[PDB]
Design a protein around this ligand. Structure first.
Ligand SMILES: Nc1ncnc2c1ncn2[C@@H]1O[C@H](COP(=O)(O)OP(=O)(O)O)[C@@H](O)[C@H]1O
Ligand SMILES: Nc1ncnc2c1ncn2[C@@H]1O[C@H](COP(=O)(O)OP(=O)(O)O)[C@@H](O)[C@H]1O
Ligand SMILES: Nc1ncnc2c1ncn2[C@@H]1O[C@H](COP(=O)(O)OP(=O)(O)O)[C@@H](O)[C@H]1O
Ligand SMILES: CC(=O)N[C@@H](CCC(=O)O)C(=O)O
Ligand SMILES: CC(=O)N[C@@H](CCC(=O)O)C(=O)O
Ligand SMILES: [Cl-]
Ligand SMILES: [Cl-]
Ligand SMILES: [K+]
Ligand SMILES: [K+]
Ligand SMILES: [K+]
Ligand SMILES: [K+]
Ligand SMILES: [K+]
Ligand SMILES: [K+]
Ligand SMILES: [Mg+2]
Ligand SMILES: [Mg+2]
Ligand SMILES: [Mg+2]
Ligand SMILES: [Mg+2]
Lengths: 381, 1046
């Protein structure tokens, strides 16, 4: 149906052999999503060893460096008569439900929005939608790809409804039972409602301390246990309020930084920024050398697996306990070398009750927002 | 008659010094000719501001490609369009060189594409200075002692044989690129080195500085009929490029024997060279004998053909194009007379003067001296029936601050206290005309002035006459001045303003006094034949030297004011706006009256309107014309600043202004009123304040934090004037729009690539926006709704915005068409000026399909990018770096499925060349956090990286390999380091990235690096955003707008 409508999507294929798998993954390039437990893989070997533990398997090109956009909408006889577009803070790869949502969009091109809208017009018509639905999109510049479509209310319907001051479900319920509906003041595709004087941010809630030993790190499978949302004149304010609402506590002391090597180009400015705001920085071995080599002062710390083997280096558990460290930033990826050690760092923060950031985009936005009591009703006035 | 069914025509691309709008004008005439003969036409020109590139009308090609005029892309177009003819003579040197390269490669032969008109062989013979010499030696014509050489060593040899001083001039170039007088060995070394970065062959030639410089425009058809259509005498002698010269037409100081000798030599040479079409030829004539030298022939339309066409009313490009189809001159109608052929040589019963316009004050490194390499950014043409009349008009046309021929400088600048008046006279400059006035005033003999300036004394006699009239008038008053005297003053070009200052009156009073004596100008036609046959057209000028009008005044048409001379910040976009308006009026059956003085423009082509006055855009003269025609109204919003600044004065003198009231234009240009209006509307803006004291300044700057703008100039530290908070790290957004009764009925929002701080006109524009929040767009839109309503806008306007997240601040509002109106109009497929013109004259408008605030038009399937053009190589020693004052000389635009593609196409269209070798990187320390990723990216794409000292240590410390290089100021002090000059020369480095800011430590050294790249002819990037986007875009076609609009 999407091909017929000329609506783009990530290359995918169902396969029943390892050789089909490998052939396809080769034909589109790693990485690839895998649905036999969703799971991503970055290499020929990584795959073989996932399958040899799991009847066909769907493969999808994992698009890297991509924004993710939610379309929440209501259809009437295949036309869209209410809709709302939000952008995740995080790149595609973090699951919708673990994602932090911005409404209205912040960094999406106007042409992409037009595509998101046009694709939604065609989908609503192709499936004769009369009721609530949702479409998730990858966006990379002007490439707009459809990920999935759900012909039902999505979990972001309350956020979107309250934020825009329109009960999407009230509208949808009326459509479904044939009650009349005035579309003049609804956010149709032709006349969206876009907040000008305020922004809304939805943040996920987690229950890591209660999930004893759980690796507090976002996978393609979802892990959050609830949501909060707050409002602000801009993103930084709204974002800080949302984060505080989750239990996140703004550090008053030092920040521990450990990142996978490939994040360095993008992280340098995040680190300079945290330093210019006056936060004392601690870091794992390589990250500390690197920061100092770039004239950002950091104090190195010991790996947990190596406590005692160098008396010049303090243990992290001790720096946390002493109150020297009250935020941890840990950014692993597929090429992380010290998988266990970094797991221990992440789990130590959780079990010490200090906040932990493991996503680059969230971490960037945080650093920007600390650079400096209202609610929706204030802004709607 | 050549049989061709489809012709490809090449444009010049973006405008640049020496290669300006004359080719938009020419190429539009060519397309018209082609259509008359039923020939399908394809156009390639990335200059989106050109009128040429429009879709509608008899001068518009059937198909338009916005792509680089380079062999790569012209080949793709040829392949796709399979044309059988090629016009390469109407796009300046760009089109010429591209066409010769295609020919050399056999692409033309390969796809069966005939060159229409002058052959590539004739072209090569006029572009290669050696072949030219061979050709003229074949017929024993007269040239100066010279040698064409291909190296610096050979040039030195030639100069010793010939004897100093010598002129060098480049092959395969125009406008004196790489040229220069060389009094000595060392000057020759410096200049030839620089010349060879831009050509493969220079001519080293004995100097004939001071000889008279005489031009002819020559036509020759395929029957071997050959005529000289125009002849021009340069007032500035040999040594000042024709383009940077004052020029008169026809000649004034030649004898019949001189004039006919050179005419007949022109015809012989042009015949021998096999030229078919039009061409321009230049001579050096000895001032006191019959001795002459043939200097060059330009086998192509030129800035000189445009000028001649306007001077004579003979449309050279139109004729050229008909000739290119094998139609001979007797079979082509003189469209002006309507009853005769184009086989003739016009007769002028008036004299025209062209003067250049320079903009040099802003380029601190470049002198205002002028010579063999053009530096002017525009030109004007005035017509009068005395030299003095023609001449003083032309001076006023150049810049609003110039009153005529006076001993006072432009821009109200005082003469330096250390002035050496003899030096000024002997060394030409952009201000020498006024230095002559001064010298005549200070009692230097005319003989000594001729001796130092080389300007023929006859011209100096006229100048003295003008200054004697000034003396006479200064001793008079409103009671004492007679009618006989006033009449004479007007007859030699004195404006009412100049007279007012002598008499002790205001300009208004003086106008009243004059009309009270019934002294007024008369309206005369240019008919090409000095009245032998009457004109069917109305191509008009105004003169005090006559006793009747040549036309009636029954039309009462709608007046449209044009742009005047192009200059920096005011280019062909303002001819586009004006022409769109003129065409809209015509299409609606309304009589039109146009006033403009720019010879390069399609607005000054007589076939576009019912009455074209090629005249001054002064209050005085517009009033003369408006009241004489009894025009129904005047449109002052589609020609940039000049007409817009007349809004209130016109209003006050009984002129009916169409659209937005001049009262509203005043309100909006009044910073205090405008700002207070914005406060009322709750629309944000940067903190600002007017101050008279240093302590107020420092107090304010302290109260809002540095940096601060200053009125242009920014300052970052403590170490009346308007001060504005400079907002850092901010996006910039343009709103282009049309209002009807205070409502917005068309609009378009674009985002600059660059952060605020680079001027709009030097910025690269993206449409639609790319990184702006949707809430900011809503604010931009809401602020525009309120502004339109507050100023009751009915017509075109524009608002510029700072955007930082959701903070949206208004920078400025202009109640007229902006320079981005063509870009926006063509990109969205809606003529904003057509819409605006209909609003202004009360015509109906269907808003259903227009981009109103409620239903914008936003391209989904494509993006548009506009890139600025620069003329750094011609601005000798200029620091090629963007300030708050603007520096670009033109624009291009291209289209793509996405931004990377569109951006690469736009950049290539500017002459930017994708590096194949190493990249040099030097950045101010503060750019490091953001630049690291740009550098890794360039490294991962395989570019070898070079860098200045600290930058190289830093890259290597971050595991990005870089080879350090030496500072220019330190070459030899470390043998482990290569010099940059040498790495460029060797071909190791073919892109330079230099990112200075206010904290740059090595200011001079980094200036030298930047200027080295320019003068070596390799691309230079000095803006971080542009540099980031480039790196992203090289990570990975030949389509254009029409593809994507399908
Ligand atoms: N092609 C892709 N490239 C990159 N990330 C993707 C892609 N497809 C899905 N994702 C990520 O996986 C998440 C879940 O995808 P979805 O198909 O909606 O699964 P679920 O069944 O869990 O709803 C998305 O929200 C997105 O973050
Ligand atoms: N031999 C010379 N002596 C002095 N001036 C010269 C000489 N040759 C050319 N010039 C000057 O240089 C200008 C540029 O030369 P030209 O041959 O017209 O090259 P271009 O094609 O670049 O305009 C001329 O118009 C003239 O003023
Ligand atoms: N408050 C500001 N902060 C930063 N940059 C600014 C600010 N105001 C103006 N600029 C820059 O200066 C340029 C020129 O400003 P503008 O008011 O449009 O001057 P002009 O009279 O030359 O049109 C703008 O396009 C912008 O890039
Ligand atoms: C989180 C992560 O991947 N850490 C890095 C190491 C960073 C350091 O040594 O400072 C790793 O490869 O394990
Ligand atoms: C362009 C610029 O500012 N360069 C840096 C020099 C850094 C280097 O040593 O490479 C400067 O401070 O002058
Ligand atoms: Cl859901
Ligand atoms: Cl403008
Ligand atoms: K996501
Ligand atoms: K000259
Ligand atoms: K030539
Ligand atoms: K010339
Ligand atoms: K200067
Ligand atoms: K007087
Ligand atoms: Mg889903
Ligand atoms: Mg030439
Ligand atoms: Mg020339
Ligand atoms: Mg402006």
């Amino acid at each position: 149906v999407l091909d017929e409508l000329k609506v783009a999507q990530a290359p995918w294929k169902a396969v029943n052999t390892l050789n089909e798998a490998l052939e396809f993954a080769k034909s589109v390039d790693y990485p690839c999503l895998l649905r036999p437990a969703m799971n991503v893989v970055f290499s020929e070997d990584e795959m073989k060893k996932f399958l040899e533990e799991a009847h066909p398997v769907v493969l999808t090109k994992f698009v890297e460096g991509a924004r993710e956009v939610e379309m929440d909408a209501v259809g009437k006889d295949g036309r869209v008569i209410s809709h709302a577009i939000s952008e995740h803070v995080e790149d595609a790869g973090v699951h919708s439900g673990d994602a932090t949502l911005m409404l209205p969009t912040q960094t999406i091109s106007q042409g992409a929005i037009e595509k998101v809208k046009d694709a939604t017009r065609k989908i609503a018509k192709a499936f004769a939608i009369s009721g609530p639905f949702n479409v998730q999109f990858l966006v990379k510049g002007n490439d707009v790809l459809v990920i999935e479509c759900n012909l039902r209310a999505s979990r972001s319907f309350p956020f979107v409804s309250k934020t825009l001051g329109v009960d999407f479900i009230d509208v949808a319920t009326k459509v479904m039972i044939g009650e009349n509906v005035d579309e003049k003041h609804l956010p149709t595709l032709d006349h969206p409602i876009i907040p000008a004087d305020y922004v809304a941010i939805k943040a996920p809630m987690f229950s890591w301390p209660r999930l004893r030993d759980a690796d507090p790190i976002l996978r393609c499978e979802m892990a959050s246990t609830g949501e909060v949302a707050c409002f602000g004149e801009g993103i930084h304010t709204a974002f800080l309020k949302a984060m505080l609402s989750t239990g996140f506590k703004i550090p008053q002391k030092g920040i521990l930084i450990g990142i996978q090597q490939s994040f360095r180009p993008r992280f340098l400015g995040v680190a300079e920024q945290l330093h210019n705001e006056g936060f004392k920085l601690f870091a794992t071995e390589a990250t500390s050398d690197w920061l100092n080599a770039n004239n950002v002062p950091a104090t190195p710390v010991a790996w947990p697996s190596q406590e005692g083997q160098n008396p010049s280096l303090s243990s992290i558990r001790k720096l946390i306990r002493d109150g020297s460290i009250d935020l941890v930033i840990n950014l692993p990826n597929n090429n992380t070398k010290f998988v266990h050690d970094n797991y221990v760092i992440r789990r130590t923060a959780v079990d010490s009750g200090i906040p932990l950031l493991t996503n680059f985009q969230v971490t960037k936005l945080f650093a920007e927002a600390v650079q400096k009591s209202k609610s929706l009703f204030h802004y709607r006035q | 008659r050549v049989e061709v069914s489809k012709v490809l025509i090449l444009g010049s691309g973006g405008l640049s010094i020496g290669q300006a709008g004359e080719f938009d004008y020419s190429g539009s005439q060519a397309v018209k000719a082609m259509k008359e003969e039923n020939v399908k036409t394809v156009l390639m020109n990335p200059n989106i501001a050109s009128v040429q590139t429009n879709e509608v009308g008899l001068k518009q090609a059937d198909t338009v490609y916005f792509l680089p005029i380079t062999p790569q892309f012209v080949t793709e177009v040829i392949k796709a369009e399979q044309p059988d003819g090629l016009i390469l003579g109407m796009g300046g040197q760009t089109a010429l060189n591209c066409g010769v390269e295609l020919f050399k490669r056999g692409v033309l032969k390969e796809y069966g594409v005939k060159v229409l008109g002058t052959s590539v062989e004739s072209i090569m013979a006029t572009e290669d200075r050696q072949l030219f010499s061979d050709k003229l030696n074949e017929i024993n014509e007269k040239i100066a002692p010279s040698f064409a050489v291909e190296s610096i060593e050979d040039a030195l040899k030639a100069a010793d044989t010939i004897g100093y001083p010598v002129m060098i001039r480049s092959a395969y170039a125009l406008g004196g690129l790489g040229s220069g007088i060389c009094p000595n060995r060392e000057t020759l070394m410096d200049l030839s080195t620089k010349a060879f970065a831009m050509t493969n062959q220079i001519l080293v030639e004995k100097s004939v500085t001071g000889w008279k410089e005489i031009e002819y425009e020559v036509v020759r058809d395929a029957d071997d009929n050959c005529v000289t259509v125009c002849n021009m005498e340069n007032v500035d002698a040999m040594g000042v490029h024709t383009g940077d010269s004052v020029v008169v037409a026809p000649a004034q100081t030649l004898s019949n024997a001189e004039f006919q000798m050179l005419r007949r030599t022109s015809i012989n040479v042009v015949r021998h060279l096999g030229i078919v079409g039009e061409c321009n030829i230049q001579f050096a004539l000895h001032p006191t004998s019959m001795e002459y030298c043939i200097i060059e022939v330009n086998a192509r339309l030129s800035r000189s053909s445009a000028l001649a066409s306007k001077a004579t009313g003979y449309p050279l490009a139109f004729i050229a194009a008909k000739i290119a189809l094998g139609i001979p001159l007797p079979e082509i109608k003189n469209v002006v007379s309507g009853k005769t052929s184009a086989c003739f040589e016009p007769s002028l019963d008036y004299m025209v003067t062209k003067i250049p316009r320079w903009d040099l004050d802003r380029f601190h490194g470049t002198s205002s001296r002028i010579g063999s390499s053009m530096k002017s950014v525009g030109e004007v043409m005035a017509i009068g029936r005395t030299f003095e009349e023609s001449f003083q008009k032309a001076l006023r046309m150049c810049h609003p601050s110039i009153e005529g021929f006076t001993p006072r400088l432009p821009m109200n600048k005082e003469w330096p206290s250390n002035l050496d008046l003899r030096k000024e006279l002997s060394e030409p400059s952009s201000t020498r005309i006024y230095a002559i006035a001064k010298a005549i005033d200070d009692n230097m003999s005319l003989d000594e002035i001729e001796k130092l300036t080389y300007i023929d004394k006859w011209f100096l006699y006229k100048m003295r006459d003008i200054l004697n009239m000034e003396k006479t008038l200064k001793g008079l008053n409103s009671e004492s001045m007679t009618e006989e005297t006033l009449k004479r003053a007007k007859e030699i070009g004195f404006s009412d303003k100049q007279i007012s200052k002598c008499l002790g009156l205001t300009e208004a009073q003086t106008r009243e006094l004059r009309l009270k004596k019934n002294i007024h100008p008369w309206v005369k036609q240019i008919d090409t034949l000095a009245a032998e046959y009457p004109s069917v057209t109305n191509y008009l000028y105004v003169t005090y030297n006559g006793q009747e009008h040549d036309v009636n005044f029954d039309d009462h048409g709608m007046m449209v004011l044009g742009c005047g001379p192009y200059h920096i910040g005011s280019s062909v976009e303002f001819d586009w706006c004006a022409v769109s308006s003129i065409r809209t009026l015509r299409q609606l059956g309304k009589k039109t009256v146009v006033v403009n003085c720019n010879p390069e423009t399609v607005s000054t082509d007589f076939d576009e309107c019912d009455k074209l006055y090629f005249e001054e855009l002064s209050l005085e003269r517009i009033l003369d014309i408006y009241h004489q025609e009894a025009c129904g109204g005047c449109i002052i919003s589609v020609g940039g600043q000049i007409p817009n600044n007349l809004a209130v004065p016109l209003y006050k003198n009984g002129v009916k202004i169409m659209g937005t009231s001049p009262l509203q234009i005043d309100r909006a240009e009044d910073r205090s009123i405008f700002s207070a209006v914005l406060d009322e509307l709750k629309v944000a803006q940067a903190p600002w304040k007017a101050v008279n004291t240093l302590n107020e300044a420092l107090e304010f700057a302290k109260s809002v934090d540095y940096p601060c703008l200053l009125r242009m100039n920014v300052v970052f530290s403590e170490d009346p004037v308007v001060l504005t908070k400079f907002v850092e790290g901010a996006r910039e957004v343009e709103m282009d729009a049309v209002g009807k009764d205070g409502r917005v009925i068309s609009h378009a929002i674009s985002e600059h690539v660059e952060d605020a701080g680079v001027h709009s006109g030097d910025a690269t524009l993206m449409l639609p926006t790319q990184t702006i929040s949707q809430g900011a767009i809503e604010k931009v839109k809401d602020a525009t709704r309120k502004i339109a309503k507050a100023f009751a806008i009915s017509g075109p306007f524009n608002v510029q915005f700072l955007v930082k997240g959701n903070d949206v601040l208004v920078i400025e509002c202009n109640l007229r068409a902006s320079r981005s109106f063509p870009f926006v109009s063509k990109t969205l497929g809606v003529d904003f000026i057509d819409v605006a013109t209909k609003v202004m004259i009360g015509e109906n408008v269907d808003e259903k399909h227009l981009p109103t605030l409620d239903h914008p038009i936003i391209p989904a399937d494509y993006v548009a990018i506009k890139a600025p053009m620069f003329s750094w190589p011609r601005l000798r020693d200029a620091d090629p770096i963007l300030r708050c004052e603007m520096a670009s000389t033109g624009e291009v635009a291209c289209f793509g499925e996405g931004i990377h593609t569109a951006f690469l196409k736009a950049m290539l269209s500017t002459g930017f060349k994708i590096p194949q070798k190493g990249i040099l990187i030097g950045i101010q320390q503060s750019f490091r956090p953001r630049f690291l990723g740009v550098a890794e990216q360039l490294h991962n794409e395989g570019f070898k990286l070079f860098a200045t000292e600290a930058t190289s240590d830093w890259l290597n410390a971050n595991n990005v390999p870089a080879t350090p290089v030496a500072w220019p100021s330190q070459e030899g002090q470390n043998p482990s380091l290569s010099s940059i000059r040498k790495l460029i020369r060797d071909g190791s480095i073919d892109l330079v990235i230099n990112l200075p800011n206010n904290n740059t430590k090595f200011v001079h050294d980094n200036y030298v690096i930047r200027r080295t790249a320019v003068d070596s002819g390799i691309p230079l990037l000095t803006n971080f955003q542009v540099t980031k986007l480039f790196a992203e875009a090289v990570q990975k076609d030949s389509k254009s707008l029409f593809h994507y609009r399908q």
